[model samples]
Target: MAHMERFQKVYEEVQEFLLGDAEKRFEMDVHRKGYLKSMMDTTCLGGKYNRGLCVVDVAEAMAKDTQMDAAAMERVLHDACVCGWMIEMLQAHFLVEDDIMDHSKTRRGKPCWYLHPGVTAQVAINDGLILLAWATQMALHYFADRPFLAEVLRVFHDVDLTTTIGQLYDVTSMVDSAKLDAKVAHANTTDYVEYTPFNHRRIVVYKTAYYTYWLPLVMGLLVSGTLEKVDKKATHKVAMVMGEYFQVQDDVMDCFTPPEKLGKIGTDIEDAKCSWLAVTFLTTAPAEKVAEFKANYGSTDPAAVAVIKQLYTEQNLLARFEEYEKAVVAEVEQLIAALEAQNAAFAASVKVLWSKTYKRQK
Candidate 1:
C-alpha cells in the first residue's frame, strides 16, 4: 500500500516535469509547448513503470539505517521519487525512438505518437530527442547541489549509451533479404547470419539488463548514499542475470500474449529481431526446419507469420522457456542470498524487484 502511494506520487512528479517546468526550461513557444504537453502526456504514462518504481523501492530499503529523522527521510523519498520519474522520462524517450525503428502502429493499446494525425516521422524524431534532453535536464535540475551529482549523471549517461550500442547490435545483427545482395546470392553464401547463443546473450545483456535492472538499483544506492557500502560488481552481476531472465519472459510474452492484453502488437517476428525464440529455433532445429523458418521469419505477410508461429509451437519454445525460467529463478535466489550476507536491505530490495516480474503476464 505504501509503495502504491509512492508510485502515484512519482507519476505526479512526471506530470509536473513534462507539463510544467520543461516548457520554460527549453524556452519553447506556445505551439511547441502545447505539442510537447500533449505528446508527453500520451506516450509517457502507458507502461507498468516498474523501472521507476524500482528506484524508489531500492532507495527506501537502503535508507533504512541512514540515521535520518522523519523530515530527512521525507526529503529522501521526494528525491528518490523524482529520480524515478527521470528514469521514466528516459524510457519514454526510448519507446518513442524504438517505435520509429520498428514501424509500430500501436502502443499501450493506442496509436503510436508517430501514427497520430499530425505527427509524422520527421516530427517524431525530434520529439524523441526532446524527451531524452529533458530527462538529462531533470537530473541536473533536481540534484544539482548533491555531492554525488557527478556519479548520478555518469550512470545515466552510461546506461543511455550502453543501450544505444545494444540497439546498434540489434539493428545490425539482423539477417534478412534486405541485406542480401546479388554478389552474395551469386556466391550462394546465404548462411552468413548465425543465430549464435553469444549474440543473443549480448543483445539481452547490453540492451535490457543495464537500463532495466541496473539503472534503478544504482540510482537507489546513489540516492541512499550506500554506493560505497555494497560490492559494485556483485550488484551488476545480480542485475545482469535478472535482466536476462526478464527479457526472456518479455520475448515469450511478445509472441504469446495478445495485443489487447499486451497493450501493443509484438513485432519481433516481422522485424527479424534477434528474439530468444529465433535463437532456439535456429540453433537446435534441423537444417530443413531452419530453412523453412528463414523463408517466413521476416515476412510481413500474415500467412508467413502464421507459419513461423506454427514452427514455434512445433519447437516447444514455451516449455523450453519454462525450464529456463526455473533455472534462472534458482540462480537469482543464490545471488540474492549471497548479497544478503553483505547487506540485508539490498537483498530485500532485490527480492521485491524479482517478485514484480517472476511470472508477470504483461
Candidate 2:
C-alpha cells in the first residue's frame, strides 16, 4: 500500500516530464501535442497499474539490499518509477491496437480510443504507433547513464517482438475464411487451430506472460543492478507460471464476471479466440458434446452465445476454476520457494505480485 502511494507521486512527475517534453517538441504543432496528451491520459491512466507497481516493489527491495548512498538510492527509486510507467505506456499502445483488432467497444468503462469522435481506426493506429515510440524514448531518456542501458532497450525490443508473435498466433488461431481467396481458402483450409492445452500455453506465454509478468520483474532487476544475483532463466520459468495462472483468471472473468465489474464486456467466445475455457472443454468433452461446442463456439448469434454460456455452467467451469486457482497457487508457491534458496528477497518480491491476483474479481 505504501508503495502504491509513492508510485502515484512518481507517476504524476513522470506524466509532467513527458508532457513538458511534448510541449517543446511539438510547440509549433499544438494539435499534435494536445492529441498526444489526450491519448496518454485516456488510454494509460486508469488501469490497476499492477504491472508498473511490481517494478517499483522489486527495484526498491533490491536497491535497499544493495545499500547505495542516499542520493543514489533516491535516483534508483526515481528511475524505477520511470521504468514502471514505461511498461504502462507500452501496455497502452498494445491496448489501442488490441481494441482496434478486436473491434472492441469500451475500455476502462469508456469507449475505446478508436471509437472516439474524429479518431477512427486510421488515426488511432498512428496514435498507437506514436505511443509505442514514446515508451522507448522515455526509457532511453531516463536510463541513458545506466550501465544496463543496452540491456534495458534489448528487453523492450524482445518483449515487443515476442508479444507481436504471440498475438499472431492468437489472431490466426481463429480465421475468417471469408477473407481468404476462394481457391486458397479451400486448399489451405481456415487457419483456425482447434484449442488445445499446448496451443493455449503458447498464446499465454507469448502474448500475455512476457510483457505482463516477466518484463516488469526483469526491468526491476536490470535497473537495480541485481540481475546477476538471481537465476534469470529460473525467474522466467516462475514468471511464466504466474502468467498462465493470470491468463486463466482473465479467461474465467471474461465469461462470468459482470460487465460493470469487468470494465469491458466479454468477447472471447464471440471473437472465436483460443481462450482457456474453450481448450478445457474441448479437451475433455465427449464426441457429441464436443460437436455441439464446435457448432456454437465462435458464432455471434445470440443463440450461440447462450449455448456457450450454458456449456460453461453445465461443465461446472466456475467450480473447476476454483480448483485450478488453488492448484496454480500451490504450484506458484513451490516455484517461488525454490527461488528463495537462490534469493530470498527476490522470492518475496515475486510473492507481492502473486498476492494481488488472489481471487481477483476483474
Candidate 3:
C-alpha cells in the first residue's frame, strides 16, 4: 500500500479505539460528548504526518528479515507504524493545548481545535490531556508483551518529563517578554533567549528526537532481538541533533515560507514566539535596529512580518540557520556511515531516518 493508505488505516484504527473506549464517555450532555469527539478527530488530522512514516521507514530498514516473507515483514511494519502514529497522537495532545494556551486561531488549514464553537478553553485542555492518556494506554496495550517494554516505557517517561520542563520554561519566557519595557528592552532580550529559543530547542530534542528517531529504531531493534548490540549513545546523539535541526527549520519556515506551503502565516512572531529566527535576529542585528524591529514589528501585523523578514535577511539569519542545518545533516550522515561500517543491523534504519530528516518540509 501507499504511504497515505497505510496512514489512513492506522488513523482510523486509533480513532475507533479512542471513541469506542468506555472511559471516553462524557458525564455531561450528549451534544457536548459528540462535539468533543469531533474535535478529537479534527485534532488528529492536523499535522504533517511524515514524521510518523519516517519511524516506520527506519524500523523496516533495520529489520533483520531481509529475506523474510512479505507476511512477516508486514506484521513488523504494522507495529512500527503504529508506534509512529502514537507519537503523532502525543504531539496532537500537546499542540491542542498549546494552541489554546497561545489562543491560536487556526491549525493546519482549519480552526484551532480548541477554539471550535462551543468548545471552551478549559474543556479543550481536558481533551488534550485525555488524548495523551489514550495514547499511553494504546502504546502499553500494543507493546506490553514485547521484551523491551520496560525500556520503551522508560524512554516515554523521560521524553514526557523533559518536554514538560521545556513547556514550563516556554510559558515563563513569554511572561518575561511581556514585562520588558520598550525603553529598556535590550537588557531583556537575554531573558527571551533563555525562555524561548533555548527552551524550544530543548523541548524539541526531548519530544521530537526520541519519538521520531530513537524510540522507533530502538523498538525495532528490541523486536528484532538486537537491542543489546546497538549503540544507544550514538543513536541518541544523532537523533537529538537531527530533531533540533528539524524544529529550527520549522521555526524558519513559519516566517519565511509562504502560507500556501506552510499552512499558516507567521503566528510565531505575532505571539512573540522565541523562535530561532527571532533569537538570531535579536542577537545579530545592530542594537538600534533590533530595538526598532522589536518595538514596531513584534506582533503579527503584515508590515511587522515584512520588517522581521527584512531584518532576518539583512542579518543573514536564514542563511546562518541553513548552514547549521547542513552541518547537522553532515554529522548525522557521518554517524550513519560509521554505523554502517560496523555492519550493525540498525545502520540502514539510521540512514533512512537521516534522509527523512533532511528532506522534511512541514
Candidate 4:
C-alpha cells in the first residue's frame, strides 16, 4: 500500500511537470504547449511504470539507516520520485522517436503521438527533445549538491547513447539480400541473416535490457546517496543478464502475443527488422519453409503475415521460448541468490526489481 502511494506521487509529479509548469523554460507556443501536455498525459501513463518505481523502491532500502531526519527523508523521497519520473519521461521520448522512425501506427494501444492530425515530424522531434531536457533539468535541481550527481547523470547518458547505438544496429542489421552468400544460404539463412547471436545479444543488451532493467536500479542506487554499499561490478553483471532475457522475452512475445495484449500491432516482420523469430525461423524451419519465409516475411500483406505466423506456430517456438526463458531465469536466480548472501538488504531491493520484470506479461 505504501508502495502504491509513492508510485502515484511520482506519476502525479510527472503530470505536473508536463502540465503544471509555467516558468517558460523554452518558449514555442501556447498551442504547442497544450498539445505536448495532452501528449504527455497520454504517453507517459501508458506503460506499467514499474521501471520508474524500481528507482524509488530500492531507494527506500538504501536510505533506511545512517540517513536524514524528517525533512531530509521527505527530500529524499521527492528526489527519488523525480528520478523515477525521469526514466518514464525518457521512455516516452524514446517511444515517440521510435514510433516515428519505425512508422509505427500504435503504442500502448493508441495512435503514435506523431500521427495525430496536427503533428509533423518536426513537432514530434522537438517534443522528444523537450521531454529529455526537462528530465535533465529536474535532476540537476534535485541533486545538484549530492556527490553522486555526475554519476547519476552519467548513468542516464550512458544508457541513452547505448540505446541509440543499439537502435542503429537493429535498424541496419537486417538480412541483406545482396550479401547472402552460398555458405549461409546453403545451410539455411536469410539474405539479411547477418544478425549473429553475438551482435544480436549486444543489441538487445543495449536496447531492451539497459532501459528496461539496468538503468532504473542503478539510478536507484546512485540516487540513494549510498553507492559504496553495493557491489557495482556484480550489480552490472547481473543487470545485463536480466536485460538480455527481458529482450528475448519481449521479442518472443511480440510475435506470439495478440495486438490487444501488446498495445500495438507487431511489426517485427513487416518492418524488416532483425527479430529473433525471423532469424530462428530462417535457420530452423524446414527447407520448404525457408523459401516461404523469405517471400512472406516482412511482407505487409495480411496473408503473408498469416503464412509466416503459421510457420512460427509449426516450428514450436513456444517450447524454444520456454527453454530460453528457463535458462535466463536460472542465471538470474543464482546471481540474485549470491547477492543476497552478501547483502540481504541490497539483494532484497534488487529482487523487487526483478520480480516485476519476471512476472510481467505485457
Candidate 5:
C-alpha cells in the first residue's frame, strides 16, 4: 500500500477504537455519541500525520537493507503509526480540557468538544481522561511482545507526567497573574504590570514542545532500538530545540499567516494567549505603547483587537518573529549536524525530522 493509504487505514482503526460500538456496553445518547465521534474525527483528521510517518521513516533509515523484510517493515510502520496516533490522542485530551477551561466556542472549524449539546463541561473532562486511558491501552496491546516495549512505555509515561506538570504550571501562571494584580490593587499602585511575555513563552514552550516534537520521534527511536546507541543528553537537547522551534513557528504563523491559510482569525491574540509575539510586543514597545496595549489588546472588544494589530505592526513584531524563527531553524540544523557527528543513524533520522518540520505552516 502507499504510505498515505497505510496512514489512512491505521487512523481509521484508531477512530474505531475511540468510538467503540454503539450496540455494545459503550452505547450513549445519540447526541453524546455524535459529539464524541466528531471530536475524535476532528483531532485525528486535521493533522498532517508527518510525525507518525517520521517514526516509520526513521525505522526504514535504520534497518539494514538485508534485514528489511516486508513483515518486519510492516510491523515497524504500524507501530510508528500507533505511537504517533497515541501522542495525538494525548493532545486531544489536553485540548478538550483546554477548551473547557477557556470556554472556547469552536475547534477545527466545529464546536468545541465540551460545548456540544447534551454534553456538560464536566463530562468532557472525564471524556478526555478516557481518551488518554484508551491510548495507553492501545499502545500496550500493540507493543506488548516487542523487545523495546518497556522503553516505549517508559517514554509514554514520562511524556504524560511531564505534560501534566506543564499544565499545572500553566494554570499556576494564570493564578500568579491574578495575584499580582490583587497585590497592586491593595497597594493602590498603578505601575505594576502583571503579565510578562517572557513568562508566557516559557509556559507555551513547556506545554507544547515536548509531546508534539520530542515524544513522537523519541518513541519511534525507542521502538527501533536506536535510542540506546545515541548520546542520551545530546538527543534530548536536539529534540527540545526542534520542538521549541516548531512551537515558535506555530505562534508566528497564528499572528501573520493569511486567514484563509490559518482557517480563522488568530486565537492567540483573541484568547489573550501569552504567545511569543505578545512577549516581543510587551518587551520592545515604549511605556505609553505598552500601556495602550495592556488596555486594548487583551480585551474582548473588536476595536481593541484592531488597536493590538496596529501596535503589532508598528513594533514590527511579525518580522521580528520571522527572524527569530529563522535563527531557531539554523540552531536546530546545527544541533542536527552535531548529532550526526555522533551517530549516523540518529543523524539521518534528525535530518528527516528537520525537513518534515521546517516551513510547516499548519
Candidate 6:
C-alpha cells in the first residue's frame, strides 16, 4: 500500500511536471498552436509504465536493506522516479522514430503521431528529437549534482546509439536471412538452446536488452547510489536474458495478438523483421504450415493478412509460444537465482521486470 502510494504520487508528479515543463518551450502563447504538447502527451503518456517504474522498484529493493533517514529516502525515491521518467521519455523518442520506420499506423491504440492531422513527417521526426533533448534536460535537472551523473548520461547516450544499430540489423536481416544451417535447429535442441535468436540475436540484444534491461536496472542502481557495490557483469548477464525474453514476448504477440488490442498490427511478418514468431514459424511449424506463411506472410492486403493469421492458427503458434515461454522462463529463473546469490536488489529488479513480461497478454 505504501509502495503504491509513493509510486503513484511520484508518477503523477513527474507527468504533471512534464506538461508544465513542455509549456516552458512555448513561453509565448502557452496555448500557442503547436504539436509538441499533443505529441508528447499522446505518444509518451500511456502504457503499463513498467520501464519507468522499474527504476523506483530497484531503489526500493535496495533501500529495504539500508538505513537511510525518511527525508533522504524520500528524496532518493523521487529522484529515482524522475530518472524513470527520463527513461520513459527517451523510450518515447525511440518509439516515435520506430513507428515511422516500420510504417506502423498506430501505437497504444491511437493513430501514430505522424498520422495525426496537420502533422508532417518533418514535425514528427523533430518531435522525437525534442523528446530526446527533454530527456537529457530532465536528467540534468534531477541529477546534476549526483556523483553518478556521468554514468547515467553515458547509459542513456549509449543505449540510443546501440538501439539504432539494432534497428539497422533488424531491418536488414529480415531481407537476407542469417546463414544458419537448416540443421542448426533440432526439435530436441529446443530445451538446450536457451537464448539463441531466431537470427539477428545481436539485434535483439542491442535493441531491446540494452535499453529495456540495462538502462532501467543500471540506472536504478546508479540512482540508489550503490552501483559500485554490485557485480556489473553478472547483473548485466541476467539483464540480457531478461531483455531477450522481453523481445521474444513481443515476437509472440506479433503472431498471436490482434491489431485492435496490440495497438498497431503486428508487422514483424510484413516488415520481414527478425521476429521470434516468424523465425519459429520457419523452423518449427510443419511444412504445410510453413508453406502457408511463405505464401501470404508479407502481403499488405486484408485477404493476405487473414491467410497468414489462419496459417498461424493452423500451426498452433500459440502452443509453440507456450513451449518457448515455459522453457525460457525456467532458464531465466536459474540465471536469476545465480544473480541473486551475488546481488539481491539487482536480481529483484530483474525479477520485477520478468514478472511483468512472463505470459503477458500483449
Q: Pick the candidate with the highest lDDT.
A: 2
Off by over 4 Å in 1: 17-27, 176-192
Against the hidden reference, what TM-scores do the models get? 0.93, 0.94, 0.83, 0.90, 0.85, 0.86
Candidate 6 lowest-lDDT run of ten? 186-195
Q: For residues 87-158, could you state the per-residue lDDT of candidate 3 as single tens digits?
A: 677777878888887777777877787777767687888889877887776677767786656766676667
- The lDDT of each candidate is 0.83, 0.84, 0.69, 0.77, 0.71, 0.75
Clash number for each model:
0, 0, 0, 2, 0, 0
Better-scoring candidate (TM-score), 2 or 6 = 2
Per-residue C-alpha lDDT of model 5 across residues 1-362, encoded as one tens digit per residue: 23567777887887676556542566567787677777677655665666666766666566542266788777777887787777777887877888787777666666677787866697888888877876786777778798877887788788788877777656555333445553453321133244576576567657876777677768777666677667778777877777767777777777677656654345666666666777778778899998887676546788888888888999998778778778887888788888888877768878877787787776
Ranking by lDDT: 2, 1, 4, 6, 5, 3
Give per-residue CA lDDT, model 1, range 279-358, as digits (tens): 88888788988999978887789999999898998989889898898999999999999999999998899999999979
Best by TM-score: 2
Candidate 6 TM-score over all chains jointly: 0.86
**What's the ranking of the predictions by TM-score, best on top?**
2, 1, 4, 6, 5, 3
Model 2: runs farther than 4 Å from truth?
Answer: 26-28, 176-193
Q: Among all windows of ten consecutive residues in candidate 1, which has the lowest summed lDDT? A: 183-192
Model 4 C-alpha lDDT versus the unseen true structure = 0.77
RMSD of each: 2.9, 2.6, 4.3, 4.0, 3.7, 6.0
lDDT score at residue 360, model 6, on the 0-100 scale: 82
Clashing pairs in 6: none
Give the winner by TM-score: 1 or 5.
1
Q: List the residue pairs that clash in candidate 1.
A: none
